[PDB]
Design a binder for these strands. Structure first.
Lengths: 51, 117, 151
RNA sequence: GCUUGAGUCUCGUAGAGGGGGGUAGAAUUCCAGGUGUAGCGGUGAAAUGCGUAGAGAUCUGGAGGAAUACCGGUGGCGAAGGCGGCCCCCUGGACGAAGACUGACGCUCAGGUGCGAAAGCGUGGGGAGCAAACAGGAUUAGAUACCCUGGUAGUCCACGCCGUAAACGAUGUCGACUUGGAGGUUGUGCCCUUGAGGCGUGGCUUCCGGAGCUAACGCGUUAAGUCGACCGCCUGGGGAGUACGGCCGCAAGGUUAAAACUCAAAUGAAUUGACGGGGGCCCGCACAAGCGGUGGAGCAUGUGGUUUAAUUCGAUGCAACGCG
């Protein structure tokens, strides 16, 4: 979660949060408890991941 | 006044508004500025521009403390936050840490229903 | 413009000063295909402009037009189902094209006697940037300055 | 009698199988306090709402309830419903390896009995979040809706009831046989284990496909192929899974289950097109960028209407209206 750097620093370059929290994990927990849509969203996500 | 010389910039980016609170390392607030309090009410208070002018305006109003070092703590998602920390090192601050402190439940409370828009 | 990227046609420069800039200014002023009339108006008006300001001809014109050129202008998007007025940087040819259109339009708005006096007084009011075309430029810049939040 | 079906014993393996008890960490809400100050929240935009009685932000301390991120996987377990932190206790099943034992003890099953999501019901608790009802704000022609702000039952626990779901692989159970390929998961044997190998042999499971079948779509060794055993159910659409009666249920209702009348269709799958406020690519003064008009005035001319003895007939969205 943290970053620090010594005096050679210019830019933020914190892409630790395109790794874990920001993009998916908080936008996922904005909306409803189903049990049902996730079983089919994961079903078609794993059925789309195919050659 | 009171001459703290190090603080924390808690930026609270949400989808509708970013609210920047500059405090000390004890956690006592020294002065805040919101994107909605800088003109541009409404669809324009959730933009990176509004967040950066919110952060410029929060860098003002803590001149009475002589803050040079600060950590940055970032909550929430938002069109803000990224631009926000930029405005902080456009205001002479030595930005030391950038932590992202978004609250994530370990499957806690049930989130609200919504949005069949 | 759907498909066709275009060239542009070359205008003959001004027959008194060799200025294609001022040639496009007499084309912006021209009505009903009467070019002789419009260049008479431009020569009279800029001649009294050069006599009044005492500078010279087309540097008095170039100053009076430099005060009315827009910096950035608003522009509609309609991308996310919403009406945004985004600010966008004006191209130089469009920059002085808008400058001349605002000078000429504001000069047609004025209430003096002859067109050479309306436009000579409009360029003179734009030399110390207090006329109507500068209020059009400040108006455009208030729109693009208020809506700066979209880039 | 016999062991190739079924079962017992020995040793292990994997597992969100079940029931009871405890605990942990993040987060939400509330309460008390510090800093601090003008907004916060919300939306397509807003407003209701909260806020100078000091909100929101931020830090500290506390309480409480529910759910258990990451692992997490067309992964696993379960007859099905379903089961997801970690630990203990009680407990069910499955699978594998070698050997021993019983010796057809088997398969299916009407009535019967049990289990059976969610909502609901009863009694007693609990109540943080979420949220039917409800209230307010918007949107709209209206808006008893979608959106916003609140919000009660309920969701959670104990015991009892209900007894249903698109309770679905829309595929009853058990057994046998019939070309293949790529995986996943869990055992086990053999070989230099010369490593994240090589060769087999089981259990469960995913995707694609051969013959075959199928109205087609598709199924395809986990069959919808080729057979056998037993059960359940169907007989045109509507009326109607309704009424009456019976049984069950506290009720809601559940189950069993018609007829009169009425139609000549209702239906399945696939084809061609058209359409979509579906998707991709592309064009045209289509939009955009501009310039000049029309709609306002007077007149010209055409039309509708009205008038008239007649105001000849035809043209009438675009593509009729100085048109024939």
């Amino acid at each position: 979660i943290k970053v620090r750097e010594n005096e050679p620093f210019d830019v933020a370059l914190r892409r630790f949060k395109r790794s874990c929290e920001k993009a998916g994990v908080l936008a996922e927990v904005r909306r409803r408890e189903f049990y049902e849509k996730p079983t089919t969203e994961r079903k078609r996500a794993k059925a789309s991941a195919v050659k | 006044r009171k001459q703290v010389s190090d603080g924390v910039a808690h930026i609270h980016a949400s989808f509708n508004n970013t609210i920047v609170t500059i405090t000390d390392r004890q956690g006592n607030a020294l002065g805040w500025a919101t994107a909605g309090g800088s003109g541009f009410r409404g669809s324009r208070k959730s933009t990176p521009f509004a967040a950066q002018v919110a952060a410029e305006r929060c860098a003002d109003a803590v001149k009475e403390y002589g803050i040079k070092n600060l950590e940055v703590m970032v909550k929430g998602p938002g069109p803000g936050r990224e631009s926000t920390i930029r405005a902080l090192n456009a205001a002479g601050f030595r930005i030391t840490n950038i932590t992202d402190v978004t609250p994530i439940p370990h499957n806690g409370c049930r989130p609200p229903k919504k949005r069949r828009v | 413009p759907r498909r066709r990227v275009i060239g542009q046609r070359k205008i003959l420069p001004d027959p008194k000063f060799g200025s294609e800039l001022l040639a496009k200014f007499v084309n912006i002023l021209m009505v009903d295909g009467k070019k002789s009339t419009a260049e008479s108006i431009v020569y009279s008006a800029l001649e009294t402009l050069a006599q009044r300001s005492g500078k010279s001809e087309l540097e008095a014109f170039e100053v009076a037009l430099e005060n009315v050129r827009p910096t950035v202008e608003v522009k509609s998007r309609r991308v996310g189902g919403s009406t945004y007025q985004v600010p966008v940087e004006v191209r130089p040819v469009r920059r002085n094209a808008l400058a001349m259109r605002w000078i000429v339009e504001a000069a047609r708005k004025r209430g003096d006697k002859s067109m050479a006096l309306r436009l000579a007084n409009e360029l003179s009011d734009a030399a110390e940037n207090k006329g109507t075309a500068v209020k059009k430029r400040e108006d455009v810049h208030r729109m693009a300055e208020a809506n700066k939040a979209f880039a």
